[PDB]
Design a protein around this ligand. Structure first.
Ligand SMILES: [Mg+2]
Ligand SMILES: [Mg+2]
Ligand SMILES: [Mg+2]
Ligand SMILES: [Mg+2]
Ligand SMILES: [Mg+2]
Ligand SMILES: [Mg+2]
Ligand SMILES: [Mg+2]
Ligand SMILES: [Mg+2]
Ligand SMILES: [Mg+2]
Ligand SMILES: [Mg+2]
Ligand SMILES: [Mg+2]
Ligand SMILES: [Mg+2]
Ligand SMILES: [Mg+2]
Ligand SMILES: [Mg+2]
Ligand SMILES: [Mg+2]
Ligand SMILES: [Mg+2]
Ligand SMILES: [Mg+2]
Ligand SMILES: [Mg+2]
Ligand SMILES: [Mg+2]
Ligand SMILES: [Mg+2]
Ligand SMILES: [Mg+2]
Ligand SMILES: [Mg+2]
Ligand SMILES: [Mg+2]
Ligand SMILES: [Mg+2]
Ligand SMILES: [Mg+2]
Ligand SMILES: [Mg+2]
Ligand SMILES: [Mg+2]
Lengths: 160, 142, 184, 258
RNA sequence: GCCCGUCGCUAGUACCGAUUGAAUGGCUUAGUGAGGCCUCAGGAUCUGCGGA
RNA sequence: UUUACUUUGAAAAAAUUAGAGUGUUCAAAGCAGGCGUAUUGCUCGAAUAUAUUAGCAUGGAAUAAUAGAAUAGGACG
RNA sequence: UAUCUGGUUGAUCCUGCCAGUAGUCAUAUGCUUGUCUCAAAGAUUAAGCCAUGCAUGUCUAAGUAUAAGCAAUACAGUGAAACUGCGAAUGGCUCAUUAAAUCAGUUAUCGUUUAUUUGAUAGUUCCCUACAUGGUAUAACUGUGGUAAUUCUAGAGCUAAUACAUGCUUAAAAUCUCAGAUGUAUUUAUUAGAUUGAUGAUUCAUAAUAACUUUUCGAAUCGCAUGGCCUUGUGCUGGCGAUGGUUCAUUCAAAUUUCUGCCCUAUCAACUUUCGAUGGUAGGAUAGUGGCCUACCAUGGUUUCAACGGGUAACGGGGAAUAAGGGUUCGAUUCCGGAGAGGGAGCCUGAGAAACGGCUACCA
RNA sequence: GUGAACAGCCUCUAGUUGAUAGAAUAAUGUAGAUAAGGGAAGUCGGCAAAAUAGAUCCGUAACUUCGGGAUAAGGAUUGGC
């Protein structure tokens, strides 16, 4: 049952100290590394199962490989992702139509649509305006405070 | 200190520039500081040529801890002395004392001249060697 | 790893200290950068407190200040000619604080010509103003005729990842020339 | 050991909190905050042990999470928030304010105050420094930094803090003859007037204090808090006014009620 | 009267003792030396002359 | 000049120790609790002393030690 | 709570121990054991070995929900799973090591790091998106599996973000260079910081100048209420917060650090120093000081006022027993500090670990 | 010349080139060598052989008649330029 490792370049299996962003190992803790045995990249009689991906189609089809087709489980969630998928324009109001899954559960079929992320929203614009106005207001308040402190300093230096 | 540039590196006070463009008087601008706690900056430190980056006056160290007094028992190292700090330790059961001492290795600026004897005053500085945590601040050649 | 603790490094009386408190992370050391010349490669070291140091390996260019005109031009390091701490560093051209290097001198040539313009070694009337201050040391201007300016490294390339420095001048310059003539 | 401690064992808590010994193994560890660990009073202690509003820590959290309690004008729903010296704790329900001042015995006394002076609070100037961009600032005893302080404000002075804008309204100078609270040491909780300040360069500065009854005691400069001038404290003093009756006259005062 | 030592009987306790005795631990000389870490490189294949 | 010594003051976590108050039914304990009521509650406390090493600040100058001007290279102006 | 008595003799007075006597939160054991309150308890020997089960997880109104989960015109409630964040470095246990080490009191950081908390703080960025960018992205999930077996995971198909990676808008006023430059962060050099802030004291705070960066920050985030003006339009402004963010200060801390103080032992008198011992210069390394390490140099450093070595059935202290006074003995153990997780060593993540209910190796 | 050297090895002066020859290259010999892995199991017995070896530096125990043991043992280095 030992998985194959992509770049080992051996016909046998060896132990490697695996890291977070690699195959054959899911770290159970931040920074954890485990020494696990993985099978080399070269196929041999040691393999119980090999994995193939069809990358060129030819003559008569096989069952459950082209006759069957599994639909993608999820439509796009981000606004620009839905636009890029549906071949829309930027000014096309991607809210109007979204992939809608009907859940025939309680004779209601209340369609469950995804929430949309990065959507340009009046709330986002209000937040942006609030941030910009707070920034400029703080800058003005600091400038006037510095002005009045300099006035205090000049007044108390004028005592001579 | 005997042709101060006598080591393999150029000996100089950091961030103290002798500008060769300006035709000043000394041409050898020397930095110094008042160490504080009523310790007078010696004229030797004021007008010296040594560098001694560990000097309490012309160096980068500061005197901020305990002020000890001791008797010089060794001057055999370079810029470092060992002072003997004699004291009497009380033994309560016998209501009596016993003579004890603790040697304290102390860095001595070239501004001072010390010999065996020569009761000195030393001020605590930051660690400047494995064993040295004190700098000579008054020579008091008693 | 490397420890900077003093639980080893036997006491001043010469007594060998017994061990306690197996090596702690807060007293670790690390290996020297051993900065070389050319083909800049800077590695980030995650240090204590979440901060970051920059091990400069194989540094090619650095910012060097004249400090007589206050210019601090960026230049390329030719090589290492003197090291007070280790001659092997000179031999292996290791970049390190206080190392005496040679810089290209061409940015300094350009700045001097564009600012004063008085044929140092081979808006109109600003040089008329800044002409009296155009004389420089013979031992500095003579280096431009060879295109190699002596400089001292002031940054710590193993710590900051930079190889900044200053051009040698005056007594420091004379000292390092005397050492160079004695060792060469 | 490997990082900051998060627990506070009982019998290791500050004694001023007057915590029961056989209640549990732990005391409320003051969170990081304005004043200190040892010099603070956690809101849970102030709410359950000094006022008896809440019966336990659960009810303390229930009080705090419905935004009743307010420290220095801010809601402060943190159960172990380190409220310390001269903090204003206002409860809007049971509408009343308290000023955290030390009684004569050194404990944080329950000191009921009115809103017209709960508006502000006093702060001892821990340091005066130049901030970034050359902006001066004052660091007060409660960790507050206030920018552009009056250029005559020095360390060991006191400043009246608006506590609505957090600015300097008035400032008292550390000088001989000014009223001082003692905020540490053996004489913690005592109120008097400065008689002399001994310098002790490199060491700790000492200060001699004469209370109203002419008792004179010397204490370190670290734990003297200027609160005004003679007879004119900028704050409402607690019931004892820092008189420090001896045990004999305390017994006489107690037995005068018979 | 009391008494001392050898020599006999029995019991017990240490000591010496061939075994170039044995074991354990610290320190140490000379060797071999896992592993992680830094570094000289290397380049599966995932990529848009570049990157991981 | 340099000390020792001694006074005084701040310091020396809490718990523990001595110790004040307090009918846990007494007590060991604990820091509680007390007051008259048909309240829309008033109130006393959780003191005080101690560690006499070392350090810090401070008064004293007996006792004990230490140093001065002798080839004057002395002091004062 | 300042006390003795019996035993050498035929008798005596002594020396002198033996014995008695009393206490022990001082252990064990024998016999006995009705009541109430309180409650030490695998320390001693074996820091010996461990079956089994549990002891670290965590969600708000406010990071990410299309569960093909439940409920009565994008989602709106609740919400398993997972991604993200935070925590897991606290606690608890034990006393093996450890004798100037730890620890206690006392110091220092003008010698450093510090998640968090609290307070303050960011108009400066650009060489055809901002009414808001990319997959350079994937988990969960669907489906196809391997292995006897592990909290093993492979291949294939989607999908987000406060994950990852990018990336503008804020004029105005303003001085220098010969139109541009000037925020902050980094590095170097230089200047001021006086006799124009602070300290006993600084190359301090801070500012200025010229440059420099395998780019640091300068919200493309979230909830709830909707207001005012208005060319009533995809208008302009605008509230309370949450979260995140640079620097500073603060707090919780940490790391080093001054002075003085440890039991027995000379049947330990010299020790340390080639392989760092003591100091100097330079460098490297560190968060930072420092022989912490490296190179060259000097020959130092400790010691009869007991070094160094050895023992400890030694963790230190607060304390405990007994005590006229002076003392003797004990302190594994309720609090504080240290150290360790079978023995060592190495290291990842992280603010913080040389972590062990983390990993890697060797040993058993 | 090398080298400590009247050692061994090569050479100059001088002397000799004299030992019955030629051809083949079996066994067994005599003399000289080598050997995988093991390492005294061979044998009366390590006989024979092997291993070591100069010099420089370090380090050197029991025991002792204090003189030794001692080159004890055990390590390192060595050319050329
Ligand atoms: Mg600690
Ligand atoms: Mg007896
Ligand atoms: Mg009954
Ligand atoms: Mg045990
Ligand atoms: Mg713990
Ligand atoms: Mg500075
Ligand atoms: Mg150094
Ligand atoms: Mg003990
Ligand atoms: Mg032990
Ligand atoms: Mg103990
Ligand atoms: Mg034990
Ligand atoms: Mg403990
Ligand atoms: Mg540990
Ligand atoms: Mg065990
Ligand atoms: Mg470990
Ligand atoms: Mg366990
Ligand atoms: Mg643990
Ligand atoms: Mg010869
Ligand atoms: Mg053979
Ligand atoms: Mg062989
Ligand atoms: Mg053999
Ligand atoms: Mg045989
Ligand atoms: Mg045989
Ligand atoms: Mg035989
Ligand atoms: Mg033979
Ligand atoms: Mg030999
Ligand atoms: Mg022999």
């Amino acid at each position: 049952g030992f998985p194959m490792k992509q770049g080992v370049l051996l016909p046998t299996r060896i132990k490697l100290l695996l890291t977070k962003n690699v195959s054959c190992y899911r770290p159970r803790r931040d920074g954890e590394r485990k020494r696990k045995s993985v099978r080399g990249a070269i196929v041999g009689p040691d393999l119980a199962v090999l994995a193939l991906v069809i990358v060129k189609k030819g003559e008569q089809e096989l069952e459950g490989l082209t006759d069957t087709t599994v639909p993608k489980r999820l439509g796009p969630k981000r606004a620009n992702n839905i636009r890029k998928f549906f071949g829309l324009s930027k000014e096309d109001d991607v809210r109007d139509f979204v992939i809608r899954r009907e859940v025939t559960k309680g004779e209601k079929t209340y369609t469950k649509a995804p929430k949309i992320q990065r959507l340009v929203t009046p709330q986002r614009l209000q937040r942006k305006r609030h941030q910009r106005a707070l920034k400029v207001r703080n800058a003005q308040a600091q400038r006037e405070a510095a002005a009045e402190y300099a006035q205090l300093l000049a007044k108390r230096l004028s005592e001579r | 200190e005997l042709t101060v540039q006598s080591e393999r590196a150029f000996q100089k006070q950091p961030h103290i520039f002798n500008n060769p463009k300006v035709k000043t008087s000394k041409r050898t601008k020397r930095w110094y500081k008042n160490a504080g706690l009523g310790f007078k900056t010696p004229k030797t430190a004021i007008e010296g040529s040594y560098i001694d980056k560990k000097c309490p006056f012309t160096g980068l160290v500061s005197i901020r801890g305990k002020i000890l007094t001791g008797t010089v028992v060794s001057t055999k190292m370079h810029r470092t002395i060992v002072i003997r700090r004699a004291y009497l330790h009380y033994i309560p059961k016998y209501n009596r004392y016993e003579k004890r001492h603790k040697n304290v290795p102390v860095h001595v600026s070239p501004a001072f001249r010390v010999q065996v004897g020569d009761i000195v005053t030393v001020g605590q500085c930051r660690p400047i060697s494995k064993t040295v945590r004190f700098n000579v601040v008054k020579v008091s050649a008693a | 790893g490397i420890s900077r603790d003093s639980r080893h490094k036997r006491s001043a009386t010469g007594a060998k200290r017994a061990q306690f408190r197996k090596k702690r992370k807060f007293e670790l050391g690390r290996q020297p950068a051993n900065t070389k010349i050319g083909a800049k490669r800077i590695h980030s070291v995650r240090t204590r407190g979440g901060n970051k140091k920059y091990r400069a390996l194989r540094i090619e260019t650095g910012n060097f200040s004249w400090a007589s005109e206050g210019i601090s031009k960026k230049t390329r390091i030719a090589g290492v000619v003197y090291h007070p701490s280790n001659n092997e560093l000179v031999r292996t051209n290791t970049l390190t604080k206080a190392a005496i290097v040679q810089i290209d001198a061409t940015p300094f040539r350009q700045w001097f010509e564009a600012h004063y313009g008085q044929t140092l070694g081979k808006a109109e009337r600003k040089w008329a103003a800044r002409a009296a201050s155009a004389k420089i040391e013979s031992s500095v201007e003579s280096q431009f005729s060879a295109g190699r300016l002596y400089a001292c490294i002031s940054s710590r390339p193993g710590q900051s990842g930079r190889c900044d420095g200053y051009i040698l001048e005056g007594e420091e310059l004379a000292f390092y020339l005397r050492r160079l003539t004695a060792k060469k | 050991a490997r990082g900051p401690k998060k627990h506070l064992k009982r019998l290791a808590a500050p004694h001023h909190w007057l915590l029961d010994k056989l209640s549990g193994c732990y005391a409320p560890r003051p969170s990081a905050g304005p004043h200190k660990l040892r010099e603070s009073l956690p809101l849970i202690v102030f709410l359950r042990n000094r006022l008896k509003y809440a019966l336990n820590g659960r009810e303390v959290k229930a009080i705090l999470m419905q935004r009743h309690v307010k420290v220095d004008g801010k809601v402060r729903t943190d159960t172990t928030y380190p409220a310390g010296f001269m903090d204003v704790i206002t409860l809007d329900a049971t509408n009343e304010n308290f000023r955290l001042v030390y009684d004569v015995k050194g404990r944080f006394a329950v000191h009921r105050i009115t809103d017209e002076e709960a508006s502000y609070k006093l702060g001892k100037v821990k340091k005066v420094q130049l901030g970034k961009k050359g902006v001066p600032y004052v660091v007060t005893h409660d960790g507050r930094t206030i920018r552009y302080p009056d250029p005559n404000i020095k360390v060991n002075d006191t400043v009246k803090i608006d506590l609505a804008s957090g600015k300097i309204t008035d400032f008292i100078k550390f000088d001989a003859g000014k009223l001082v609270y003692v905020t540490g040491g053996r004489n913690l909780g005592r109120i008097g007037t400065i008689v002399h300040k001994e310098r002790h360069d490199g060491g700790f500065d000492l200060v001699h204090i004469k209370d109203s009854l002419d008792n004179t005691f010397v204490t370190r400069l670290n734990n003297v808090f200027v609160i005004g001038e003679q007879g004119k404290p900028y704050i409402s003093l607690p019931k004892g006014k820092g008189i420090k009756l001896s045990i004999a006259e305390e017994r006489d005062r107690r037995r005068a009620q018979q």
